[PDB]
Amino acid sequence: GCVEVDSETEAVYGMTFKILCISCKRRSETNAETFTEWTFRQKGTEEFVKILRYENEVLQLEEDERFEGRVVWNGSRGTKDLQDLSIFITNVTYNHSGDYECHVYRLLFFENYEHNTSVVKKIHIEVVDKANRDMASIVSEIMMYVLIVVLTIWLVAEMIYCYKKIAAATETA
Amino acid sequence: SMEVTVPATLNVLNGSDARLPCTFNSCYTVNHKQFSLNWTYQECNNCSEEMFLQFRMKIINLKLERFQDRVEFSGNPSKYDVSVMLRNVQPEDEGIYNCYIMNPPDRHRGHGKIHLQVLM
Amino acid sequence: GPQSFVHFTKQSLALIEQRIAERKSKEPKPSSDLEAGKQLPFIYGDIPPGMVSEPLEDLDPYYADKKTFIVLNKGKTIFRFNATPALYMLSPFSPLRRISIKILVHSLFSMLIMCTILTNCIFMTMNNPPDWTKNVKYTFTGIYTFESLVKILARGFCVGEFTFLRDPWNWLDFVVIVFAYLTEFVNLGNVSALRTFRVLRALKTISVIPGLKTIVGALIQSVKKLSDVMILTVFCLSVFALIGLQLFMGNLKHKCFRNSLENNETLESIMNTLESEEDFRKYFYYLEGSKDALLCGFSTDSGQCPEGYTCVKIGRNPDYGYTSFDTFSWAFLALFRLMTQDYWENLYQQTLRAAGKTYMIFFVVVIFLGSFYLINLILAVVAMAYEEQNQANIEEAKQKELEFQQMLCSPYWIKFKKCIYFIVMDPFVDLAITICIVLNTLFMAMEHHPMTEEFKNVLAIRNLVFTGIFAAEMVLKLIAMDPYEYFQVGWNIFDSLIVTLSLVELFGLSVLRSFRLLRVFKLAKSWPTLNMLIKIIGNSVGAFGNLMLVLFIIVFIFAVVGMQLFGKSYKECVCKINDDCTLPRWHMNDFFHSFLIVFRVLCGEWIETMWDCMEVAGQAMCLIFYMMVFFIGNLVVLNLFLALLLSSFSSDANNLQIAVTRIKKGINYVKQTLREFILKAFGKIWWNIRKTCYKIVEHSWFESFIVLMILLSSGALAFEDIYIERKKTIKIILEYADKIFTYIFILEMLLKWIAYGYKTYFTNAWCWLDFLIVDVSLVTLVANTLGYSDLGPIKSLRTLRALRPLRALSRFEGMRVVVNALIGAIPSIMNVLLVCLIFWLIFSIMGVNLFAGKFYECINTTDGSRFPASQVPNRSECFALMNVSQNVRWKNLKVNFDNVGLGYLSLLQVATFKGWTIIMYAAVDSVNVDKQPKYEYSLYMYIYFIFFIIFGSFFTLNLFICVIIDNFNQQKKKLGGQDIFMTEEQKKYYNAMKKLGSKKPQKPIPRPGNKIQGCIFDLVTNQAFDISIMVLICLNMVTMMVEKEGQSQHMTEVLYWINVVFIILFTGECVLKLISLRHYYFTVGWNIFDFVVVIISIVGMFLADLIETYFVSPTLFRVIRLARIGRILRLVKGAKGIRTLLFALMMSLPALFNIGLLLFLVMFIYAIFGMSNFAYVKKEDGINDMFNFETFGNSMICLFQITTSAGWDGLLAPILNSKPPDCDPKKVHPGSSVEGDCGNPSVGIFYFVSYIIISFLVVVNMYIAVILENFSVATE
């Protein structure tokens, strides 16, 4: 239905990257009208600058040279109730590394009640030249092979032991 | 039809006081914002429905010149009694009397007819 | 003998009185024969013409000494009275009494009373009777009053022995008449129709209708026998109601409340001013078209508020306020609802939304133990009671019969007659018409809704063909076998019937043509096991009919009474139960609708209709009415249905073969002649390693290791939820873990090959299943490795990973024993699946013919309101409105009667009573094929549904149960009386518990020498001490029952201090015992229980006064205070009924564990399948935010719910959406790469139907068997 998955934090230079921002409604049946502003600060600087503001259907980009021509929308389409506010960075540069805020402004409609809610998602990314396998998949394939060889060594250990015993019994008989 | 219990005939003397029993019976609780009732006079059978007592959020009197100061409310709407008091009845006060009661959420409007006769 | 007849003259009164005085100065059962209301023995022969109808002296010796006088009618009916003066006035000799008696003991009087009662009942069947018929009511009063005096002037009122009030039926009469007298001046209704039940006493003796005696007598004896079970039921529901009160008090008052209130308003300022729903709906959150505010909770596993509302405890409880655990009485009603499983799913879900999903353990415990155990106990008692009655009546009659017999031109037409008979023969002629009957049934099953004209008219010429053949065959038989001989055959009559009604339509009665399928059961004479089952059915047909007679008389009487007590209320207070100020779909204002409500209560559904009646007519009368009806109908008469079937399963030509012999003659002879014509024309090393692998694979190390691996693989499957793409580490881990688990299992299979051998491995079913599972895993693995995975079909292979837990089945003897019992029963399940499917096919073809394509409607998609037919008359105007307006749709139901298969599904929903309502409303609203449904335009299709329920629910679902239970008994008999549900080591423990229960003399506890210690001994071992302690326990139970939602702070402190003085008393008695009985106190099992609960009481008090003072955890406090219940569980030791009944449960628990284990494994498998398939459905009807198939927890919760079939229609309805108008094939779910909210209808249907069937076979049927066995062992 609606799962809030956290963005990936590793971008490869010269390739494409997808920044995830998923903000859901506590009750899926309710009706809302959401827009979003995205702001970013570069690694090395202390100031969050707005870079884009996505409205009902159209996307507006700020005049920033770092993102202009290389950021497309990759979130929800054809609705005012946006539960996915993701963006795309085509041709990732070394300048797209820092801290991102995904501002979600959501106005819910009730019987005679209109609630103005906000929610902020924080995403940190770094731009590398080479993608690195995470340790969790490194450790685990090395560990997958430990249990293979120790279970196999264990089994054939028990086979040999039981056999030199049974071979003795037959000779005895 | 909502149960309205009224006397068809009313008998009062000249110079008497007269009470007018009109009691409805409805399952629903009386809500004052909702509850309406109206009391009409009829000098003759085929004459007009001139009111002299209204209820809407409260008790209203239309100060009719026929019943100079005689008409007085004598009921408890939550007790379902809505009778009225005709003080000091004179001969001119024979006719026909109605109490049109609507107690929402019931959609039927109750009706009672009362013919008061001043024997002299 | 006969010469013993004599007129009671004062002298025999004086000789009886003298004898009584002699007996007094000095200071036995009577002839069941003579016993009143009986025929005078033929041994006495005829009565002297002057002695009839006269106070005569007492025959029976038992009473000859006491004071009495008997009178006999001209029908030798014995009537016993009291010699004592009536109200100290009338004497037997007195002429005034002589006349009362003369009238009383006389046939005409009673006949006329019966006539009066009947007339009255049918007159009351009216709703608005003519003004000139009220005076008939007062006319009836005086006759019932003259009634009560004829008997009283005759035999007195109450003081004596044979008197008016002594008879329980006369008690009923007295209640009726006094009630009438009261209502004459009181607002209450009329119950003058309950005295119709004396027709039941009439039937208790009717001769013309056979066996109405066995059914009414069993109906009354079951009510008498059910006493102990009722006490236990009350005790058990009060314990669970106390637990539920403690855990859920005030929870159903949770509501979501606005966070920004406009002027300066508070939750109190506004709650003192809110009146209707309109203004409640602007401060609290309501779903669309819902009467009650949405519930919520304070936990994380509870229901969520929308953003901008906050959960708060305020306002009323749901369902008009009748659903709550706020007081002991409402919690007792909730627990009775849960016990009878009536719409429990709503309570289950409301409770879980308010409290939290972790409180499902409460419902699991309640449902399984309480519901299943107690309901099957009621059945076990009724079954036994019916069996004893039948037996006694059959032997009663035996005695009689044995005693009785121990004492004891035309020749041309005849030429044609024989000529026709010659050609008529079973192998050639009768076998032909049977295959033509099944061909015709296939052609009738081929009709569906969206049909052409040609196809419909081709089926019509086929019907002409067939009915012509069948009428032709009719007259041949009639001339060979004349009109005197044709009626002699109760099977040929059925043939005549169908034929003549088929000619009537030829020259709405078309729906009576599928009953010729019932003639296919002559072939059932060939297949002998099917023959035996048909024979058993045929013997229970008579009893079935008599019970149906009793069932429909009872439903009639309760429907006149409801219409009379609650009829006007439904019309005058209609706007309280209906926003449109119109009568709801179920009401008691007329007789057809009252009948329908009563029938729905008999079918197990009483609460929803009771809410409405309680709202229009008060709580007390509606409760008494519905409880009367539910007891007598559902708890006794339906159980009697199954009871008569179960007893019919125990009591201890074929021309097909002639034709087979003819065939052996022909096919063999002709082929041989053709052949003749053709001829005319023309070192142990390998054995040592095999022994070594055997030794390895048998060791308990290997066994436990493989079992642990099996459990780890199964548990791993539960993590593949919809939130798997947030837990990245875990998903990587589990991929590689699946790799190594497949490796282990392959090594196991190869080791088993080497060890055992191919022959042994592949002649074994457990090994075959292990092999299949490992092969699916190996294939999927190599596909994922060879690049070309995700091919389309390989995802179906990944869903087969739901079958991995099936490996756990082989390993557990507990699950194995149960699986084995079921597999032994299966061949007898198929034999009845056949007969039942034939019946259901008949009904389904009928339903198709009645309702095909008639369930369409022009709805407004915004509200879901049907357009009034005055606006949208047909389909063409619905489409014309779809052109101009927008939210309009000609929409069919999803489960309908458009064809025979959808008819079968419709019928399953009606038979299980889940989703049957919407089908019935569509049916009774249907007009025609493309016409708008009009409200209750076809009101009497309810009769179709009534009849199906009798034969498809009350007979079919019961026949399954009977044949399965019989098979289990046969199995145990073949094993030699051995239990088929317990393992080898559970049987040992079972043998120990029977010894626990066998009463054995206990050695005495010596009296200690110390004077003081001895005095305490003399006190504690007195029987007054333990009566006193039982009274104190009841008073404590009352002190617990008094607690309430919203009590004062004074109430809490006084209740606390009362419980404190109770704790002190119980600790005191324990200490008194421990110093008089010394060390011999702990040698009694109940004394140890007493000690443990003393400890848990004191500890619980101090711990809860800690967990409320230092900590602030409220749910832990609530859970600790459940320790108090221990003190009321001692109300079992002094209650032999309750104790005996609970011992049956204690000795059933081992077998009730293996069933639980199997059930849990099946649940696990289905849950994994569910998470794979139905995780992304549109969430319409039963699938919502909390009850869905997204996570393992939610899956298991839904599956536990539908384990009682509750709400399975609601869970399946959203999975039947497959087309763009209802679903979206390209829905984007945020967070995943799955597209689409549509469901797969075939997978859904199979899933849910197979699940409810398995539960029926493994849970319901097996529980019944275990309880029936242990109830008998425990009462014996």
Ligand SMILES: CC(C)CCC[C@@H](C)[C@H]1CC[C@H]2[C@@H]3CC=C4C[C@@H](O)CC[C@]4(C)[C@H]3CC[C@]12C
């Ligand atoms: C209309 C409803 C409420 C009641 C219908 C009662 C009918 C179905 C019952 C009442 C009496 C019953 C009959 C009683 C006796 C026998 C004799 C038996 O050897 C065959 C069945 C048969 C013939 C029963 C058939 C069914 C029966 C006729």
Ligand SMILES: *[C@@H]1O[C@H](CO)[C@@H](O)[C@H](O)[C@H]1NC(C)=O
């Ligand atoms: C007075 O009563 C009459 C009854 O006929 C009703 O129609 C009318 O609306 C009432 N008037 C007011 C002002 O309530």
Ligand SMILES: *[C@@H]1O[C@H](CO)[C@@H](O)[C@H](O)[C@H]1NC(C)=O
């Ligand atoms: C509530 O708000 C009003 C706003 O006009 C203010 O005048 C009043 O003092 C407030 N009362 C409380 C409860 O503080």
